Design a protein around this ligand. Structure first.
Ligand SMILES: COc1cc(Br)ccn1
Length: 129
């Protein structure tokens, strides 16, 4: 897309060691599945196109972008070694939302609803077997 948006996060790299764990399978099959289909998922399902949204400062402020489309592709591509890397991606996505926007903005309310659901799902994350 536009040269004024940054390249999206890596989802493929043969040099990075990879594993499928039961925890990672739960993150794809339960956690991402639940969040992806939520009514409030859509602002999070792809990278922020700061040109289309007329937010030229967005990637001045947000230096660690992350979105659920990227996490979905990471999971589908078995990009991770462990669940914590994936949980960290989710946490980064929510934190970016809360940094860029204001308390009570619609996108913040949406992120808070998703994050509550995410926390419930992570509380049920199985032990790594
Ligand atoms: C209006 O601000 C934002 C913030 C994010 Br994160 C995504 C889209 N718009």
């Amino acid at each position: 897309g536009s040269h004024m948006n940054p390249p999206p996060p890596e989802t493929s790299n043969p040099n990075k060691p990879k594993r499928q764990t039961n925890q990672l399978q739960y993150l794809l099959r339960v956690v991402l599945k639940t969040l992806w289909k939520h009514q409030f998922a859509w602002p999070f399902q792809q990278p922020v196109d700061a040109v289309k949204l007329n937010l030229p400062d967005y990637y001045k402020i947000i230096k660690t972008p992350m979105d659920m489309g990227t996490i979905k592709k990471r999971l589908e591509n078995n990009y991770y070694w462990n669940a914590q890397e994936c949980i960290q991606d989710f946490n980064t996505m929510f934190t970016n939302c809360y940094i860029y926007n204001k308390p009570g903005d619609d996108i913040v309310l949406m992120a808070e609803a998703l994050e509550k659901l995410f926390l419930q799902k992570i509380n049920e994350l199985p032990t790594e077997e």
